[PDB]
Design an enzyme around this catalytic site. Structure first.
Site, short mmCIF file in Angstrom:
data_model
loop_
_atom_site.label_atom_id
_atom_site.label_comp_id
_atom_site.label_asym_id
_atom_site.label_seq_id
_atom_site.Cartn_x
_atom_site.Cartn_y
_atom_site.Cartn_z
N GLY F 64 0.82 -1.20 0.00
CA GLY F 64 0.00 0.00 0.00
C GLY F 64 0.86 1.25 0.00
O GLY F 64 1.88 1.32 -0.73
N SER F 93 4.78 -5.49 -2.32
CA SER F 93 4.94 -4.03 -2.24
C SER F 93 5.55 -3.70 -0.87
O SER F 93 6.53 -4.36 -0.49
CB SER F 93 3.59 -3.37 -2.56
OG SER F 93 3.39 -2.12 -1.89
N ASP F 167 6.86 -6.45 -12.08
CA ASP F 167 6.37 -7.31 -11.01
C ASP F 167 7.21 -8.58 -10.97
O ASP F 167 7.36 -9.26 -11.99
CB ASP F 167 4.90 -7.64 -11.21
CG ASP F 167 3.99 -6.55 -10.70
OD1 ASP F 167 4.48 -5.64 -10.01
OD2 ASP F 167 2.78 -6.61 -10.98
#
Ligand SMILES: CCOC[C@H]1CC2=C(CN1Cc1cccc(F)c1)C(=O)N(Cc1ccc(Cl)cc1)C1=NCCN12
Ligand SMILES: CCOC[C@H]1CC2=C(CN1Cc1cccc(F)c1)C(=O)N(Cc1ccc(Cl)cc1)C1=NCCN12
Ligand SMILES: CCOC[C@H]1CC2=C(CN1Cc1cccc(F)c1)C(=O)N(Cc1ccc(Cl)cc1)C1=NCCN12
Ligand SMILES: CCOC[C@H]1CC2=C(CN1Cc1cccc(F)c1)C(=O)N(Cc1ccc(Cl)cc1)C1=NCCN12
Ligand SMILES: CCOC[C@H]1CC2=C(CN1Cc1cccc(F)c1)C(=O)N(Cc1ccc(Cl)cc1)C1=NCCN12
Ligand SMILES: CCOC[C@H]1CC2=C(CN1Cc1cccc(F)c1)C(=O)N(Cc1ccc(Cl)cc1)C1=NCCN12
Ligand SMILES: CCOC[C@H]1CC2=C(CN1Cc1cccc(F)c1)C(=O)N(Cc1ccc(Cl)cc1)C1=NCCN12
Ligand SMILES: CCOC[C@H]1CC2=C(CN1Cc1cccc(F)c1)C(=O)N(Cc1ccc(Cl)cc1)C1=NCCN12
Lengths: 190, 189, 190, 192, 193, 190, 190, 189, 190
Positions: F64, F93, F167
């Site tokens: 986040g 993340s 990613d």
């Protein structure tokens, strides 16, 4: 709004927890997974308190998920206590299937209650192979529902198949003639 | 917008009406009933103008309704003239079905054109018996399509069923080897 | 838009139809099947009028569908006339691909035009095997694009792969140095 | 909405919409937000007018808030490429790429009506994604501003440094102020 | 509303919400779609029950359509990590990670009620953007299926090849079929009711 | 939804308050300011109760806000007790950043857990100078994260930059090999 | 987009007006009032041009409004010319009812066309008296449809009632066996 | 919000739980399954507390589901205690049906209260046979309701059918003359 | 809203429940069935506590449903205790009707409060006879309201009809002159 009940204040509970104290379970909503899991837990809780005392299942529900209904059905048949059933107001779809699954001789309906039986409803979108998969599944589900309904009512599977092809509404007395319930509960005294 | 072309003598047409004057029909959109009805009418009109000259069907379409596609398919087989087909850009679903339905030896694709084949799509919501009716119909439809594709490509029904179970993308060269087209149109002069 | 009308003999045409009379085709919007089908038709019409005179393709387009762009690409290479290309304003995506597809030596850009190259965009939602099918297809598409771009620019396929990994903005002079066009069209007046 | 004008001609009654009638006199109307469709139409009109007469002046009417930078440059490059002089006049308002094209007219033939407004500013854009994507977008929009500022410097005579300060924020100019800045050559005073 | 249960004992009346009462008997309810919040709660309950008693069996009730694969693996890895045996039973329906967790119970202690349904299938996902981004998402979801198929093969005794074919499309199994397949060990039958 | 646990020897807790009594903090959701502020408060509360006993941070989070994640990171580095970390399910993340930030030698992952690393995300809309401000800020943030990730894993900043451009999914074992965790937690007994 | 057709340009019409020149009417959409009024007008126009020449009605339609379908049906039966019918692609609901209403011996289907028959669909909301009114009306409408279908196919009303209770899909050959059409149009030569 | 009342000794209840302590049940909302299930439970709970003391049912409701209303109706007739009813404000649809179902001689209305009677409402969409099933069911339901209303009011079935064909608003005085209530409660001391 | 809690013995109550302990009832929102049912209950509860002590009804309300207002009105006149009323802020619609329904001599308004009187609002959509039914009903309702207002103010029914034809805003002093209240409650301090 769920009212709070005071015994003799002294002791207070919400109305439905007070019912459970008398071994009464309220099936008074559409049947989804959450409703089924709650009822399964309540049934197992009552058996743990007393594995021989009758349990009372109040039904006023339009039905809902077939698998959720079978979670409740199988739990009823697994436990030791008799589970009495009574149609209050209306029972349709899995609601009426569960009404018919109560202990034999202890399936009731109030005089103006309504019972509805019908075939299962579903859905499918996508490739032809996926539509075939859904069709085969819902047809198999109907055969399983009809077989048990035949066993609990005494009617043949062929008659169950014919009588559920379309929405079929029964009065309490008609449900008794059909074998879905055993007695029409008459008023006690007044 | 659709451009206007002049011309022989001084005549002005929209570009697509000019195509029809050369017996070229453009199947260049999703296939619905309105598209099929127009193409059926163009095919019959061209046959009335000349029952022996070839007709040319340009296909750049993602497909669409199966019944609308069969309206075009049956009109192609009914009329006397040969109907040539060529895939420009992409031909999917009934678009690739119609590409394969062209006159034998006259089904083409441009070198970088794409052909996709797959099984039909549909839906169904209601009582178990309504789901069964819908499933039986779409399975019959898939069987009908697969039988014709087998006849038009030369592949067995078993291979057509396996190759259309999932989305299958084919190059122009691969479409010729498969039998959906006869020739990859190569650049001239 | 309000497309003006020009009058000439005795002929009145919208400004874009007048362009076609000079063998100029305008690729001035996002590329979809409708736009591609019209341009393919225009190219074939112009060749039918004269199979030797050059055709001119003006490009001011963000690109669009890859298959639609290839419909134009293959029609360009099929017909006999040379097709010149010029970037007006901006050519991106299949728009810059088609700019590079013009007849060698006749690909141009105006001094302040921009050219963008990048890899194709797509999507895929469903089962693992469905996602794999969509991934293999869009990867095959990118190889097909990089192969052709390599042939028409002179760059290696590996260089094209690296330079299109992300959005890559090029000036007119840089597009020439890269091999996407042959010359920056400068004013022959002041 | 758009009126039609009918004129008895040599080959008989001929009808025009008012904007097509302007084009017959070599007048082009840039009177809307500038998108690709507007730019492509204006590019086609400029080439058509040059094909009709490569030496007669062309007249570009500008009442536009601007729009796409690449679309505006399509018109700019077409103006510089053709042989005829292209006159420009701001009526009402010329902002963003509109005022850029106003300053791009033939030297000495850039005008504005007395009460018209000219606005200059730096380009606008957006960027959403990974850090490297935002970097790509930032580099491109900053390059675009440098390009715009350089030409504006050439067209007005002001230094690149002054152009940067005066376009950092929205800057409104009167017709007289615009002439002063060098964006236009003369404010058109009432015909008689 | 979740009902409250009163337990009349040798001292009087005690009140719990029905699920907290289940936990007192070492029963955990997996009765909803599996997201991260559901998994974190179930992981916490498993660790709490082991801290209360590291040798008593734990009972995992499953009536769930499945959900997040990583959330399901949070539950799977905690079951295998703790010392107590974790029994599983399918009530109503176990699909997607729901049937994977059903098959992950202690060997010999995986059950299903007679009319319960079990569904197995391949994982689902999505991807939107650049071609290299689509490739990354496709490679990841395919690796996840190999992982799921590998463990499912170990828990059922079926080969990885058969599991791959049998999960290519949605596959519905009855309780007896789930036992024959090796996903469960026994169909819990009613004693006379 | 959150169950309440009854523990012998007269206290009732929600399951997460019970976890905190064992010095376990659950980072099991997307990281926003509220999530970070609560976790920071829990870390300070645990240190105030005991400044030398280990704290345990459970991570099942998609990540986040970067600044919210750094609020947690700086509090971990500031307090005296060791903060152990374990990835259960998924850590992506800022979630994986915090996993690698645990006390050296006390960073774990369950066998089937997934770890994901990538570069930060953001947006920018407005004038050219405003987009420049936003772009400079995101690159600084990336450098900060990369530099810290390099110190925590032992990998060079260049490799971290390359491996996070897109990613990047890692298995538990791959995370150990990379240096993001120290051990793959294997089964008690089993 | 409806194409413009040039005869021998010389003369130009839209494709459907050119069809009408050959006494062909296109019923190629859902049947609403506007569609019916158009077709009624076309039928009367053709009879006025020639009251003895056959008329040709092309059907590719999913059906629609029953009253709109009867506007067309009654006009077909009122005029003097034979009205031939052909199913192209699909005919369902009133579309197939009209297909069956063509001149006897001149009702056709292309080989791969589909015919669907079913009972009418409707709706009602409000007081019990209003639901009864709608029910009586739609049931009367079904009796009127079944009687005419029985007259034009040769099947009994009882069989029509049974065969339309649910959606019923017929192949062209099946529609001929049923009596809904007379011939399956085979290709002429090639 | 629902106020809290204190009180005898110092005890605190929400206002409605305090009502139930005096054997008063509030039917003060639209009647759905949830409302009916709660009222059925309150009635059975009150009978378990004392099977001879009257129960008091306060009605301020626009009505709602017919089956939910019959769940309350059948529980009233099943239990031993008399159930008194009073219309406060308004009683429509099943609300007025339940008002008329109170113990004979113990059905009331405040002076300015309103009573509305009408026939049931419903809907139906689908094949003609589905519309027929839905119509037959709602007509049977209306007949069931009308028979009981005839028994409870003393009016003939013919008058009940005519008076409920359209929305019929009645004053409290008119409701007593009609036989839906026994007395208009007048202001005391 | 965040209703504050006050503490006193040993009793903590929200500010509105504390009001009820002093026999004060707050009518401070739009009047619907929920609000009316609660106020009716409060009135009966207060009378059960003491059938002689006055009750106090604070009114700051735009009004609302007419039947809901009459539920309160009739309960006020039924119980034995006097019910005083006071307009705080604004009393409109059924709010001003109830203000005028207080025990004569004990109806008040604060100096700057406003009172609005007007005719009832309603609707009707459907057949002519349905619209007539709704019109007759709302006209009967207005007569019932005007009759009572006439009794409690002293104005003729014809005057009430005229003054309520449109929205009529009254000051506190004017409400007294009109007969809606008995006295403007002024500060007994500065
Ligand atoms: C995971 C496999 O195991 C299943 C088994 C375990 C078990 C059961 C019944 N299961 C079978 C089952 C499950 C669902 C429905 C059904 F019909 C039968 C049970 O009934 N009780 C007693 C109890 C229950 C609830 C409370 Cl609130 C208090 C006491 C129990 N106590 C420990 C384990 N266990
Ligand atoms: C029951 C109707 O069956 C009619 C038959 C009649 C007919 C046909 C072919 N129909 C069969 C048919 C229909 C649809 C598809 C298909 F493959 C074959 C035809 O092709 N023409 C010539 C023509 C057509 C369009 C133009 Cl614009 C100009 C001339 C024609 N002229 C008068 C009647 N008629
Ligand atoms: C289905 C078979 O297709 C073969 C061929 C047919 C054909 C072509 C080109 N097709 C190939 C093709 C198609 C698409 C793109 C492409 F690069 C090549 C053609 O170019 N012309 C001349 C012409 C065309 C448009 C106008 Cl407006 C005026 C004149 C032509 N006249 C009759 C048949 N035919
Ligand atoms: C594809 C590369 O080459 C394009 C070149 C060719 C060409 C030009 C000028 N283009 C360059 C260009 C393009 C865009 C902007 C710009 F500033 C210059 C031209 O001006 N005319 C005359 C004309 C034009 C429009 C009409 Cl309506 C009538 C007559 C012309 N006729 C045939 C080819 N051609
Ligand atoms: C951060 C790295 O270490 C985590 C480790 C620490 C720990 C565990 C087990 N973790 C490993 C783990 C975590 C998630 C799943 C899984 F399969 C194993 C544990 O089980 N307990 C006892 C307990 C737990 C919950 C309650 Cl409610 C009461 C008591 C414990 N007490 C202090 C630290 N700690
Ligand atoms: C208002 C009462 O009158 C009805 C009558 C009048 C009439 C008819 C037929 N109607 C009967 C009818 C109507 C609808 C459908 C149907 F099956 C029969 C007709 O067919 N024609 C000839 C014609 C028609 C259309 C064109 Cl375009 C050109 C010529 C005609 N000419 C004047 C009056 N009239
Ligand atoms: C098949 C079920 O039929 C059960 C029967 C059992 C039963 C009743 C009445 N049921 C019939 C019924 C049901 C619905 C409505 C209706 F009009 C009659 C009952 O009234 N009580 C007493 C009680 C109730 C609520 C509380 Cl809170 C406390 C005490 C009771 N206690 C144990 C079982 N049981
Ligand atoms: C259905 C028959 O209704 C008759 C009567 C019953 C009754 C009343 C008033 N009803 C009439 C009525 C109802 C509505 C408004 C109104 F103006 C008068 C009453 O006021 N009390 C005392 C009390 C009430 C609430 C609490 Cl909280 C505490 C004590 C009471 N106790 C037992 C029965 N009963």
């Amino acid at each position: 709004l769920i009212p709070t009940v005071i015994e003799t204040g002294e002791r207070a509970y919400d109305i439905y927890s007070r019912l459970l104290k008398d071994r009464i379970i309220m099936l008074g909503s559409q049947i989804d997974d959450n409703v089924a899991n709650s009822i399964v837990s309540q049934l197992l809780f009552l058996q743990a308190q007393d594995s021989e005392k009758d349990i009372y299942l109040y039904i006023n529900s339009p039905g809902g998920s077939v698998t959720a209904g079978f979670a409740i059905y199988d739990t009823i048949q697994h436990i030791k206590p008799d589970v009495q059933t009574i149609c209050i107001g209306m029972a349709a779809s899995m609601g009426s299937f569960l009404l018919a699954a109560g202990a034999k001789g202890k399936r009731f309906a109030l005089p103006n209650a309504e019972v509805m039986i019908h075939q299962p409803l579903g859905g499918a979108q996508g490739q032809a192979t996926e539509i075939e998969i859904a069709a085969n599944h819902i047809l198999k589900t109907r055969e399983k529902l009809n077989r048990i309904l035949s066993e609990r009512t005494g009617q043949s599977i062929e008659k169950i198949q014919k009588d559920t092809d379309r929405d079929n509404f029964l009065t309490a007395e008609e449900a008794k003639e059909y074998g879905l319930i055993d007695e029409v509960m008459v008023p006690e005294t007044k």
